């Protein structure tokens, strides 16, 4: 209720809003990298329950949509392969998955819409390349929505700040008038 | 004829004369009219004979070559670099 508490809260949510908006452009730049490398990957991979995701969250309804194996640490989090999403998925990563050992992943369409021997590793590589392109663009929107929610939150607190600022001025003024009279 | 690594794509659905290919048992030169077979590769060179008579030389470490019932071949390696 105090100006100090509102000033602190404003800076607190502004910090969140700046970070979420900073990750909207990151997930826009990483998605551009992921789609550039998906074209040669789609022409490469053409010819048991496997769940493909990542360790990195904050990407909306991607980990929840996909419903020993299991690539992506966030898929074992409900009931294993770890350390994916931080860096783009290489063929070597798809090889290790095949080395340790009918497949579920998110297929890239655009920025809004999605759907949920040597040849076996190629399918794992195809899923990995498709998953990270899906993961990044969904994160682009997730942090865009979060940057909208934080901005609406700032707007409501700014109106409170202005009411409290006016309230303090009047209170100081009455204490002076009364002290004089 | 399709030739691609995970990194880059060299040929996209040719339209080519013949391709020399390294295979676990020696080597196979796939002509336009070749029997439908599925083969696995070994460390060796790939020689691509272009339709205008010219030549293309790349190297292959490992992968697979697939020639279907029709006149279509898909060659794919783990790495292919020049030179």
């Amino acid at each position: 209720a105090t100006l100090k508490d509102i000033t602190r809260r404003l800076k607190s949510i502004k910090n969140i809003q700046k970070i979420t908006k900073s990750m909207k452009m990151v997930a826009a730049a990483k998605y551009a990298r992921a789609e550039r490398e998906l074209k040669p990957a789609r022409v490469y991979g053409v010819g048991l329950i496997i769940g493909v995701s990542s360790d990195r969250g904050l990407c909306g309804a991607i980990h929840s949509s996909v419903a020993i194996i299991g690539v992506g640490d966030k898929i074992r989090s409900i009931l294993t392969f770890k350390e994916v999403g931080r860096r783009p998925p290489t063929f070597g990563d798809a090889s290790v998955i095949a080395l340790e050992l009918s497949i579920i992943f998110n297929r890239f369409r655009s920025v809004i819409s999605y759907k949920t021997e040597y040849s076996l590793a190629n399918i794992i590589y195809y899923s990995l390349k498709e998953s990270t392109t899906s993961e990044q663009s969904a994160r682009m929107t997730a942090m865009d929505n979060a940057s909208k929610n934080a901005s609406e939150m700032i707007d409501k607190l700014t109106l409170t700040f202005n009411r409290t600022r006016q309230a303090v001025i009047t209170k100081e003024l009455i204490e002076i008038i009364s002290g004089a009279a | 004829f399709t030739f691609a690594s995970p990194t880059q794509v060299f040929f996209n659905s040719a339209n080519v004369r013949q391709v020399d290919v390294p295979t676990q048992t020696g080597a196979f030169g796939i002509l336009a009219a070749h029997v439908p077979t599925l083969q696995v590769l070994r460390p060796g060179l790939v020689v691509v004979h272009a339709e205008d008579g010219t030549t293309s030389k790349y190297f292959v470490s490992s992968g697979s070559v697939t020639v279907n019932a029709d006149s279509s071949v898909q060659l794919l390696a783990e790495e292919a670099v020049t030179l």
Binding site: I68, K82, E83, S95, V96, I97, Y118, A121 | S62
Partner: peptide, 23 residues
Amino acid sequence: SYIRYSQICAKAVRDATIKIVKV
């Protein structure tokens, strides 16, 4: 397996992230 063979050929030709979790 051919995968183990394929990756060994990959290491030699380059001369010119995921971690294992087991319960």
